[PDB]
């Protein structure tokens, strides 16, 4: 019924007036980990900002909500980066080794 993220806005907007936390959110997108809640920015300057009064108000909240299960915040941008490249290789190697000859008699 109710999910940390909303609970978290709501929160956010009822300790203080400070609507701010709106405007680096709503953009956002936010992602529950039964334990922990994600925030997914279009860059890196969003996340500290959020982090810095965001955090300390869901903080807050975890804790005050229950305490011996308060979770914790996560934040990055966007979704996870690409990767696909080719790969190859080559190798070699060369011997010619020998071996002297003779008896060596005796009288």
Same mark, same amino acid.
């Given at each position: 019924?109710?999910?940390? #993220?909303?609970?978290?806005?709501?929160?956010?907007?009822?300790?203080?007036?400070? @609507?701010? =936390?709106?405007?680096?959110?709503? +953009?956002?997108?936010?992602?529950?980990?039964?334990?922990?809640?994600?925030?997914?920015?279009?860059?890196?300057?969003?996340?500290? #900002?959020?982090?810095?009064?965001?955090?300390?108000?869901?903080?807050?909240?975890? @804790?005050? =909500?229950?305490?011996?299960?308060? +979770?914790?915040?996560?934040?990055?941008?966007?979704?996870?980066?690409?990767?696909?490249?080719?790969?190859?290789?080559?190798?070699?190697?060369?011997?010619?080794?020998?071996?002297?000859?003779?008896?060596?008699?005796?009288?």
């Amino acid at each position: 019924s109710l999910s940390l #993220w909303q609970q978290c806005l709501a929160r956010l907007q009822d300790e203080l007036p400070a @609507t701010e =936390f709106s405007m680096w959110i709503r +953009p956002l997108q936010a992602e529950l980990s039964d334990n922990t809640l994600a925030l997914y920015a279009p860059n890196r300057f969003v996340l500290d #900002w959020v982090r810095d009064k965001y955090l300390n108000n869901i903080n807050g909240l975890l @804790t005050s =909500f229950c305490g011996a299960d308060a +979770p914790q915040l996560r934040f990055e941008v966007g979704t996870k980066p690409v990767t696909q490249t080719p790969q190859a290789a080559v190798t070699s190697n060369v011997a010619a080794p020998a071996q002297v000859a003779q008896t060596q008699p005796q009288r």
